[PDB]
Amino acid sequence: STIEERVKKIIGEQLGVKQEEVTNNASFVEDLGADSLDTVELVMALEEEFDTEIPDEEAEKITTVQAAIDYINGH
Amino acid sequence: STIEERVKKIIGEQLGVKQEEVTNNASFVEDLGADSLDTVELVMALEEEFDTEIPDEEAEKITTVQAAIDYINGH
Amino acid sequence: KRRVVVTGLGMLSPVGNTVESTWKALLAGQSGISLIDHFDTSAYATKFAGLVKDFNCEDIISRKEQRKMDAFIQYGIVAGVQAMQDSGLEITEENATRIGAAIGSGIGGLGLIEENHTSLMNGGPRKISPFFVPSTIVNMVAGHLTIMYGLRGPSISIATACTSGVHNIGHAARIIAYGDADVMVAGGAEKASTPLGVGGFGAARALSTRNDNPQAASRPWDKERDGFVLGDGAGMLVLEEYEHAKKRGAKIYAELVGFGMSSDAYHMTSPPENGAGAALAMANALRDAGIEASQIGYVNAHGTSTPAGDKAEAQAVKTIFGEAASRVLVSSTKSMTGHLLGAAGAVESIYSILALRDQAVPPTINLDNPDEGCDLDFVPHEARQVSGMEYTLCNSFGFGGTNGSLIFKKI
Amino acid sequence: SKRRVVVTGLGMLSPVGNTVESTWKALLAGQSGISLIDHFDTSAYATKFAGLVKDFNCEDIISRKEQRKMDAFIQYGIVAGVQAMQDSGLEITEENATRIGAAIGSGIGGLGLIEENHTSLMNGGPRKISPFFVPSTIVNMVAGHLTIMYGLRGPSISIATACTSGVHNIGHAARIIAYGDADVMVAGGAEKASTPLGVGGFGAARALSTRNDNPQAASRPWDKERDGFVLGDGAGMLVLEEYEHAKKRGAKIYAELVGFGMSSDAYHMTSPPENGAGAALAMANALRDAGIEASQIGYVNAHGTSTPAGDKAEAQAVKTIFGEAASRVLVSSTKSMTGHLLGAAGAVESIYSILALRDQAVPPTINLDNPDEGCDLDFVPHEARQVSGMEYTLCNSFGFGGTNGSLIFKKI
Ligand code: NA
Ligand code: NA
C-alpha cells in the first residue's frame, strides 16, 4: 500500500471511522470527533508505523489528513 | 565465620534487630518478631545475595537463624 | 429520616454476565474458576482465577473508547449501564443535579499500568500512552457513567481494598440520607488477574495453589484451604430515596437500613484472632438499622478461604449473635465466584438483596470438612430454601484492618 | 441542632516546608518549592522539574524495616498524620478508641513501588516480586497504618477521586462525625507522583508544563503564558472533631468546617466545561450546606492548576457564583508555589484556607505577571495580602472524571 493508504488506515482505525469518512480535507477534531489525547495517540501511531520522530511543536501543526500525508512524504 | 556470617548480617538487616540478637538458635517469628511477609522477604534477600534460588517448600523449613545457615551452606 | 431503597441492579461475575444468570449459577453451586489463558503462567505459583468469560462490551463502549480504559473500567461501565437500565430512571435537566455515583476499586487498572510501564521500559516516556492516567485510576468508572448519563450529582470513589464495594454503597446511601442526592449509582469493579496482580498476591503467599483442581481451590471454612482465589467482575446498585422511587413508580428490590464501619487496628494484612473489628462493624450496622442480631436471617460472609480470616470472621459472628449464632445462616459466595476484591462487597450486596426477594440462600461449596470446634452451619454444598427472612447482612474486610457491613430489609 | 465539626489538629509535608508553620510562613512570603528533578534521569522527559519534598526524615516515626513496606506517599501520609495527631493533643483511651477513625486517600497512590515491582517482574519473573507489593502501594494503607499505630478502631475510609481526593476525604470525615459514627477523624491525603511513570504519563497527556529553563516560573495560574500544571508531592492531614467533644477537653480549635459540596461536570474525562458549571454547582452546594451567602466569602483558595482551560473555567464559575461581589472576594492559587499535589492538594490547601482565618493573611498567586484579558478578578498576585474582616474561606478541588468538591471554613 502507498503511504497515503497507510496514513488513512491509521487515521480511520485510531479515530474509529470508516475509511470513506477519512477525507483529505477533513480535520481530526472538527470532522472526525477527536480531542487532544485522540490526536496525540494518532500522531504516536503515525510515528510508530513510519519510524519517524515528530516534535510536539511540529505535531500540533498536523491537524488534518493532508497534513499527515505531507509530513510522512517530506520526511 | 564471614561468607556464613553474611546470613546473620542479612537476618538482622531484614528484621531491624541488633547483630547481638541474631543468635544461631533463634526463631525469626518467635524471638525476632518476623511475620510471614518479613519471613518471605528475608528468604528473598538470602536468595539475592548468594545468587541462589530456594523452592517455596525448602523455604517453609527455614525458620531459625541457624536453620538458614545450614541450608545456605549446603547449596 | 430519609430512607434509601435499591431500585436497580447490574453485575458481571465469573459465573454470569447479568444479575439473573449469576444468581442462577450461585444457587446451583456453579464454580466460575478456571485456568488463566491470557498470559503465560509457567513460573506463577497460581495458574487459575475467576475470569469473566465471553465479555462483549462492543454495543456499549466503542473500540476507540475501549482502548482508553482498563478492563475493570469496562466491567464497571457495563454493570452500571445494566443497573441504570434496570432502574428505568429518566435523566432530565431538572433531574441531573440530584443524581450521582459512588463507585470504586481495590487496586484499579493493573493491566494498563503494566502495559504503559512496559512501553516506558522499552522505549522511554515518549511511548507512554496519553490515556495512561485516565485509563487506570479508580474513580474513572464513576467518571464515565456520569458523562454517559449526564449525572451532575455528587461523585465519590472509595478504595478501601476488599471493603470498597461495601463502603462505596454505604456512603452512597449516606449521601442520599444527608440530602446531597436523590439517586446514586454505587458499587465496585475489579480486574486483578494480571501478571502483577497474580504475581504480587502470590508473593504475599495469599493465593491458593490448587492448580490440579481450581474449582475445588476456594474452600471457605474448610480444613484444607490454602489461600483465596482471585475473581474479576463488577457490581452496581441504584440507590434512591423512598418517596422519590414511589413517586416514579420504580421497582424496589429492598431497603438499605444498616451501614457500620470499623478498623481492626491490628495488622496490615491479617485480622485479629478474636475478630474485634468485624464484630464492631456488624454491631454498628445493627444499631444504625435499629435491629438485633437475631433478626438477621442470612449473612453473606466475607469468607475468603484463608486460614486466619475464616476463623476470625466466624468468631466475630459468634460474638455478635451469641444465642442466635446457631440460628442465623451464614455462607460465602466466594467459594463459587472467588474474591472480587473491591467489587466483592458490591456483588455480594446484590446477593444479599436477591436472597430477600427469592427467600433462598446460595451455598458455600467445597465445604467437605468444616473447621473443628466451629458449630456454624455454613450452608454447605447445596443451596437452602428459607421462609420469613426479613433481613440480610453483608460483610467486607480489607487490608489495613478496615471493615464494613450492610443490612438490607425486605420491601 | 446538627453536630458541628471543628479542626483540632494540623500536619503537613509540602515542597516549601516539612511542617505546617514552615509551609505557611514560606507561602506567605511567595516562596517557590519547585526545582529540577534529580532522583531519576530526565533526558528524554519533556518535563524535568517538580515540587519535591526536601530532606525527608521519617526514621524517628517509621523504622527502616517498616519503611521498605510502604511507598513514599504512604510515608508522607504517616508522617503528616502523626504530626496532626500530636498537634491535636488527643489522648487515645480504650473508651475513646471506637469513636476515632480516619479518612485518608490518594490520587494515584504508590507509583514508585509499582514501577520497582514490575521492573523486578520483567527482569526476573514473578519470583522477584516483593511480598509487600500490594500493602505498600494501594491507596488506603496510610489510613491503615495510622489506625494501627494509634489503636484507632473507628470508621476508616479512603476516597481516591483524583485531584479532588483531599477535599472529599475531609468532607465525608466531617459527615462521619456529623452522622454519629465518630467523634474525631484524621482526614487528608498524601501524594508522591514525581516518578518516571507519573511525570511521563502526565506529559503523555500533554498536561505538564515544559518550562525547564525556569521551573519556579512554570506554575503561573491565570497568567497569559501558562502551559500546564507542575507536579507536587507531599501530604496534608487535619484532625476533625465534634464541637462538644472538643470543647470538653479544651482542644485547639483552628476553625469550624461548615460547608461541603460535591458535583460532577458530566462533560469530558480530563477537560472541564468552558463555563465551569460543575465548579459552580459544587460551590453552591457547599454554601447551602453551610447556610451562608457568596458575599460572606472573604477568600477562595482556588484549584488554579495553571492549565489554559481549567483556570478560565474556574474563574467563570467564581464569576457565576459571586456575581456583583466577584470583584470584591479574594481568590488565589497556592499551586503557584507548591505545584499540584493531586490527591493531597485539597488536603494541604484546606489547611491554608484555615490558616488564612487564623492570621488574617492571604498567600499570593506568584508568577502572575499578566492576567487574562476581560477577567476582573483580584487573584492576589505577586505578594501576600493582609485582611481585616474575614470570617469564611472556601477551598476548591476539581479532578479527572469531572468530579468536584468544595469546603467552607468559619473562624472560631
Ligand atoms: Na459479603
Ligand atoms: Na484549592
CA torsion, ordered C227, C228, C230, C234, to nearest 10 deg: -160
Domain enclosing residue A7, as ranges: 3-74
> What method was applied to determine this entry?
X-ray
Q: Return the SS3 of C8.
A: strand
CB contact under 8 Å between A37 and D268, yes or no, is no
Could you confirm whether D303 is annotated as catalytic? yes
Q: Which residues of chain C make contact with B36, given a CB cutoff of 8 A?
A: 205
C-alpha D331/C-alpha D339 separation (Å) is 17
CB contact under 8 Å between C96 and D266, yes or no, is yes
CA quadruple D50, D55, D59, D61: dihedral positive or negative?
negative
C269 has a chain B CB within 8 A of its CB: yes
Number of domains observed in the structure of chain B = 1
What residues have CB less than 8 Å from D395, skipping those under 6 apart? D167, D300, D301, D346, D349, D350, D352, D353, D406, D407, D408, D409
C235: nearest Cα among C333, C358, C105, C360:
C105
Q: What is the CATH number of the domain that holds B11?
A: 1.10.1200.10
Looking at chain D, which residue has its C-alpha nearest residue A34? D268
Burial of B3 (0-12, 13-18, 19+ CB in 10 A): exposed
CB contact under 8 Å between D262 and C129, yes or no, is no
Chain D contact probe: residue of B21, B44, B48 with most D CBs at under 10 A: B44
CB D352 within 8 A of CB D300: no
Give the pairing of strands D49-51 and D100-105: unpaired
CB B4 within 8 A of CB B20: no
C-alpha B15/C-alpha D135 separation (Å) is 18
Helices A3-14 and A36-50, interaxial angle, to 10°?
A: 140
Ligand-binding annotation for C163, yes or no, is no
CB contact under 8 Å between C204 and B37, yes or no, is yes
Burial of A66 (0-12, 13-18, 19+ CB in 10 A): middle
CB contact under 8 Å between C267 and B35, yes or no, is yes
D121: nearest Cα among C304, C351, C200:
C200
C-alpha C392/C-alpha C297 separation (Å) is 6
D36: nearest Cα among D230, D173, D238:
D230
Percent of residues in chain C assigned helix, strand, coil, to nearest 5? 40, 20, 40
C55: nearest Cα among C189, C168, C185:
C189
Q: How wide is the angle at C-alpha C182 spanned by C-alphas C176 and C184, nearest 5°?
A: 70
For the record, the C-alpha cell of C130 comes out as 496519553
Residue of D115, D126, D176 lying closest to C44 (CB–CB) = D126
C-alpha D136/C-alpha D131 separation (Å) is 9
Ligand-binding annotation for C307, yes or no, is yes
Any idea which residue has 462538644 for its cell? D244
Other C-beta atoms closer than 10 Å to the C-beta of C378 total 23
D125: nearest Cα among C40, C209, C231:
C40
Render B2-19 in DSSP notation, one character per residue: TTTHHHHHHHHHHTT--T
How distant, in Å, are the alpha carbons of B2, C277, D203 from that of D339? 50, 39, 15
Q: Which residues pair with C298 in a beta bridge?
A: C329, C392
CA torsion, ordered D141, B17, D151, C289, to nearest 10 deg: 50
Q: How far is the CA of D144 from the centre of ligand 2 (A)?
A: 26
What residues have CB less than 8 Å from D214, skipping those under 6 apart? none
C-alpha D36/C-alpha D48 separation (Å) is 6
Chain A contact probe: residue of C58, C63, C64 with most A CBs at under 10 A: C64
C-alpha D92/C-alpha D81 separation (Å) is 15
**What's the reported resolution, in angstroms, to a tenth?**
2.7
How distant, in Å, are the alpha carbons of D10, D17, D35, D83, D158 from that of D236? 8, 12, 21, 10, 14
Give the distance from CA D127 to its chain's centroid. 37
For the record, the C-alpha cell of D294 comes out as 457568596
How distant, in Å, are the alpha carbons of B44, C143, D136 from that of D69? 14, 31, 5
How distant, in Å, are the alpha carbons of D185, D241, D253, D254 from that of D250? 17, 12, 9, 12
Q: How far is the CA of A39 from the centre of ligand 1 (A)?
A: 44
For the record, the C-alpha cell of D140 comes out as 488506603
Q: How far is the CA of C292 from the centre of ligand 1 (A)?
A: 19
Render C169-237 in DSSP notation, one character per residue: HHHHHHHHHHTS-SEEEEEEEE---SHHHHHHHHHTT-B---TT-GGGT--TTBTT--SB-BB-EEEEE
Query: How long, in residues, is chain C?
Result: 411
CB D111 within 8 A of CB D82: no
Q: Which residues pair with B27 in a beta bridge?
A: B64
Ligand-binding annotation for C302, yes or no, is yes
Other C-beta atoms closer than 10 Å to the C-beta of C326 total 11
Ligand-binding annotation for C339, yes or no, is yes
CB D102 within 8 A of CB D187: yes
C33: nearest Cα among C196, C229, C226:
C229
Q: Which residues of B are catalytic?
A: 35
Helices C307-321 and C276-289, interaxial angle, to 10°?
A: 40
Other C-beta atoms closer than 10 Å to the C-beta of D27 total 27
The shortest C-alpha distance from D65 to chain B (Å) reads 5
CB C252 within 8 A of CB C6: yes
